[PDB]
Amino acid sequence: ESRELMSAADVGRTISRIAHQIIEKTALDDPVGPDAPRVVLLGIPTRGVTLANRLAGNITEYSGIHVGHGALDITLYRDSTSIPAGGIDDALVILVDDVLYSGRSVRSALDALRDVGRPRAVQLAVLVDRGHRELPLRADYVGKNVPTSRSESVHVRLREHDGRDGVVISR
Amino acid sequence: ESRELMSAADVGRTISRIAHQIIEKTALDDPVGPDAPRVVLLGIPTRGVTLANRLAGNITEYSGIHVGHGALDITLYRDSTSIPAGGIDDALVILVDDVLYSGRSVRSALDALRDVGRPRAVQLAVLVDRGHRELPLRADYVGKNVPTSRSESVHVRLREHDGRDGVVISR
Amino acid sequence: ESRELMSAADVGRTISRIAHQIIEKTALDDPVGPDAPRVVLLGIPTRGVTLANRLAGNITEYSGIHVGHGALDITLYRDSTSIPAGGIDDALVILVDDVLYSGRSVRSALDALRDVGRPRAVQLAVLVDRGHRELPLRADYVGKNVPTSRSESVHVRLREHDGRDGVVISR
Amino acid sequence: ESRELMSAADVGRTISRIAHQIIEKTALDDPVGPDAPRVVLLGIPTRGVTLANRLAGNITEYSGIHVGHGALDITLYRDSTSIPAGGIDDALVILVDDVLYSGRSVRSALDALRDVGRPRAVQLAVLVDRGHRELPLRADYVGKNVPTSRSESVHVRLREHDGRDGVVISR
Amino acid sequence: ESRELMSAADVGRTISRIAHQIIEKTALDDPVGPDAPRVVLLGIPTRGVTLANRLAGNITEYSGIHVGHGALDITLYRDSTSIPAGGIDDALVILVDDVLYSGRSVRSALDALRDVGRPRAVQLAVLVDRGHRELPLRADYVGKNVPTSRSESVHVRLREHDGRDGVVISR
Amino acid sequence: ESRELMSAADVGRTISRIAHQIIEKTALDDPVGPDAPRVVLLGIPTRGVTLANRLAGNITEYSGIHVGHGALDITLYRDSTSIPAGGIDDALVILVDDVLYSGRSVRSALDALRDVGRPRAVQLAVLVDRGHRELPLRADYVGKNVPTSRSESVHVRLREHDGRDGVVISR
Ligand SMILES: O=c1[nH]cc(F)c(=O)[nH]1
Ligand SMILES: O=c1[nH]cc(F)c(=O)[nH]1
Ligand SMILES: O=c1[nH]cc(F)c(=O)[nH]1
């Protein structure tokens, strides 16, 4: 059994709001001072990459600033990577995924990240937080908090990846 | 120069509340069973270890449950560990520290923790969150959120370690 | 399904009786002379440790004597150890577990013990003997002899560990 | 001061009774089945070997079944081995010694035994238990329980080994 | 022969005095800082470790301060080590032994200690100074100065080790 | 700024007293022997060497005995050496320095010494002890104990090294 949690319009509005939170919180709009570092969005393959790419698109549309974005493979970090020109050294890296659950993927991403470089800081953006974290990891940007039973599943859908925008829950 | 954020009485009341939050959230009080894992408090040296010991004491006094507690040395995980007998495999491990700052100490603790065993989940408790995180790490239990400038310093004082309970800020 | 072998009151009366047997059999309350060894309780994780801790407490209450007690990790002795101050050399060590079955856990304890020191003697106390030994090992103190089939399971519950006292058998 | 605890006739009656206990308890004359494994008697050198050999003779005389028997050297297991064809894997091994005292020799046999194979279970048979065990080890078959002071000695004599059957105590 | 230098009551009163000297001299009661460093007691195996543990208990009882305490093996430093979590860097380490003689054991401890970390300072506490030093090493805390000949031996007894507290001299 | 702690006459009187203490304590003028080892003074470069040399002269003047004396370089022993004919094996070695402070130089000397030979024993003589030791090292001969703040400096002057005898303190 399945049900719609977010419509295509819902996801659009939320992704847009997330993009503006990012702009607000990083001030990427400003002349990048000493204490205001360049932003890089790295998505967790593969739908996380889709989300990071769209966020990058939105931010460019709203601010005129082109933020670097890529992908961070975590296959070899569980108990192809693509980094923008300029790397991540002393940058603000925003890890991006579609769903935050136990948090174990994000920890893998943190591990993977240090084989790449040394960011000034790392943030996390997700479309959905479905709870039941198993590590003290939290998203800095959350599209929607979706309370779930352990037996339920949350399914994020993005146009470029799955054919439609939407979020569905099933049991 | 210097000023008091928490009195000894403040620290006492706050620690007692955290202990009850832990009891509430883990339900260590009711008969264990399949769905309630044993809880282990691991402190980050040294005041985190002090705080962990006090929390364990408080928890036993309020619930009658003896929680395992120890210390997690993180020296070889930056830039001797003490785990209660029976280990931490499939336990709910709560990392304990006095101050949450950048979060890098907590990350080191997670790394050290992974060379020790495989917990069911890991939570984090701190007396003070002074902001300025550089990782997407957040405490599940927080004594007090203390806004600070980077130039300021937070000094937690615990009786078993410093002769008195209290939290002071300096510049 | 499930059935009760011992009520909480049962467990209390029995643990108290065991405590007094130990005191009687070791004469630990008498003025320790040259030829009368100090008693050390080492529990096998985890409920054996709970049981060892409670017994030590009981012994102090009934005799005023504080016996050293700790835990003996046997994980690397099958397929962190905690030894009280003064160690176990020339001591009378009482291994404590909740259930005696095949006896292999106890034999592992004997192996683990031999990497710790050389006691004068080793005894064994258990809450329940459910039979079916596969080694010539027997307990010196037994809470209750419970005949069981190979298909049954024995579940000991102790207050400090599980919130309640009791022993149940299931099939 | 010397004194006789058991006459030759005593030893004879007692060894014969043990043989029948073994036959009864292992049902070795019945068809070897899942819960009825082949029996192997291994004596501890050297008089234990004599006793194991006698028991095998008696068992054959009473049941017509020839049980495998040999010796288990424990020299390299303290603080020449001879195994019957078919080994001891999944067998019921009965360790045999003349006197059970501290229990340390038997523990050595247990250690020595696992460098030989994996028995289904291990039992222990001794002619005399003189008490004062220093380990939680007990014999499954005991010829005679002989109370002794720490200063007394128990001496087993078997004909094939010493020239007579008998048991003597000295101080 | 043998003779008593200190009674159990003597040892208790003296150990208590040492504990207060340590508290006074380190100002352990005051907040850990530059002029009051964190204290760690490291005992020399084996009775030195027990004594360190006893001192820690006393200090806790008198001051409420829980001092780290452990053991420093000096086997590999002549002609099992246990360090509390957080190590000894910039700590005040107090080496503890039962008897100071030639001073060679203490020097080995000093060597072993720098393979562990870099303390702010190192002090020494002993129950007995038996004279005859062969190095310019002296204890900062001394229980009793006992004049002895080269042919005499001093035997310290601690309850957790020997059942009683006491100091005897023999020839 | 500065003030005089010891006049040239003071230093002369003190150095003379130290020489006689050495003679008294080592009995170097007596017919040597098994339990009376030859004395060797080794100074720490450079003013310590001057003091050792002056002491040797005094001892010779007062006793007629010529003690071997030299220098012990400690440059390679932190964080030209000259050893008298006959070496230091089984000798009584007296390390000599002008000022004893933290004691870290003296420990280096003990380390430097083990690369030279094996003395029967090692003593230490200094003109001034200004306190603030960071190790359990003490001088066996002390010219003068000078209480000082950590912010002060102690300056020893010897004629052969600096043109005059004296001790001055500055802040
Ligand atoms: O049902 C799903 N399968 C795989 C996915 F990645 C997802 O989001 N949802
Ligand atoms: O007196 C004895 N000597 C040797 C033995 F093996 C024994 O059992 N008794
Ligand atoms: O300035 C100084 N030079 C050399 C010294 F030995 C001293 O004490 N002070």
UniProtKB/Swiss-Prot annotation, chains A, B, C, D, E, F:
Instruction: Tell me the GO BP annotations in alphabetical order.
Output: regulation of DNA-templated transcription
Task: State the EC number(s).
Answer: 2.4.2.9
Q: Tell me which UniProt keywords the record has, alphabetically.
A: Glycosyltransferase, Transcription, Transcription regulation, Transferase
Where does the motif PRPP-binding lie? 93-105
Which InterPro entries does the UniProt record give?
PRibTrfase_dom, PRTase-like, PyrR, PyrR_bifunctional
Q: Which CDD domains match?
A: PRTases_typeI
Catalytic reactions of this protein: UMP + diphosphate = 5-phospho-alpha-D-ribose 1-diphosphate + uracil
The molecular function terms of the Gene Ontology recorded here are: uracil phosphoribosyltransferase activity
Q: Which family does the UniProt entry place this protein in?
A: Belongs to the purine/pyrimidine phosphoribosyltransferase family. PyrR subfamily.
Its function, per the record, reads: Regulates the transcription of the pyrimidine nucleotide (pyr) operon in response to exogenous pyrimidines.
Q: What is this protein called?
A: Bifunctional protein PyrR
